[PDB]
Design a protein around this ligand. Structure first.
Ligand SMILES: CCNC(=O)c1cc2c(-n3ccc(C(F)(F)F)n3)c(-c3cncc(C(=O)O)c3)cnc2[nH]1
Length: 196
């Protein structure tokens, strides 16, 4: 298996996300949401919150275990490896989203600590995974916020109705997990939850 850096994604986006139109833009949302959904399917976290921010960025927050906060090789955080190397690694498409974003932030909460790493300009880390604060030991989760790269996509406008429909469908497949969407541009909001 040949590993590659994020440049490879930026030079052939359609190979990873299908296109660079609205469909491809929204593929970025699906990749991050799917990470949260996979974690919930494994039994960790009962709500997944999606927010379309006023600045055009998008946030997905889960309440799962939190990504591992330890080191890979050479003092490089596991989180950094997941977000900057691909074949995406270990079952997530986070690296593809990072590659196609002008910036991305990942915040992890677990073990009484809050950690954050920031990437810019197609996934170049501008910080390490830094402890930024504390939380109760019972608090766990992962939050990812990204700004899609306007130099790549023909549209960077997230569509509320498109996201709403997909999250509704995901809530129906998952069961017993609340999927929420909030649009800070318009104040629109909706939640989905299907019991079984
Ligand atoms: C908001 C979007 N959520 C994520 O992208 C997300 C990834 C993720 C995750 N990860 C997905 C891949 C990875 C890993 F490769 F970094 F381990 N973590 C794990 C996780 C997975 N496997 C083990 C543990 C653990 O605590 O032992 C944790 C837990 N929550 C997650 N949310």
């Amino acid at each position: 298996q040949v590993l590659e850096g994020l440049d490879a994604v930026r030079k052939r986006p359609g190979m990873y996300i299908g296109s660079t139109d609205g469909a491809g833009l929204h593929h970025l949302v699906w990749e991050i949401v799917d990470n949260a959904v996979d974690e919930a399917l494994s039994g960790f976290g009962d709500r997944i919150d999606v927010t379309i921010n006023k600045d055009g960025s998008l946030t997905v927050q889960d309440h799962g275990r939190g990504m591992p906060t330890g080191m890979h090789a050479m003092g490089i955080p596991t989180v950094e490896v997941i977000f900057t190397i691909l074949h995406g690694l270990h079952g997530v498409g986070s690296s593809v989203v990072n590659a196609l974003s002008s910036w991305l932030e990942v915040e992890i909460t677990r073990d009484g600590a809050v950690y954050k790493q920031r990437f810019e300009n197609g996934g170049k880390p501008v910080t390490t995974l830094k402890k930024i604060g504390t939380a109760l030991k019972s608090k766990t989760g992962t939050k990812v916020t990204f700004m899609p790269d306007a130099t790549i996509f023909s549209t960077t406008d997230f569509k509320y109705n498109t996201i709403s429909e997909r999250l509704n469908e995901s809530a129906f497949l998952l069961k017993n997990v609340t999927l929420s969407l909030t649009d800070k541009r318009t104040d629109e909001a909706i939640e989905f939850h299907y019991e079984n």
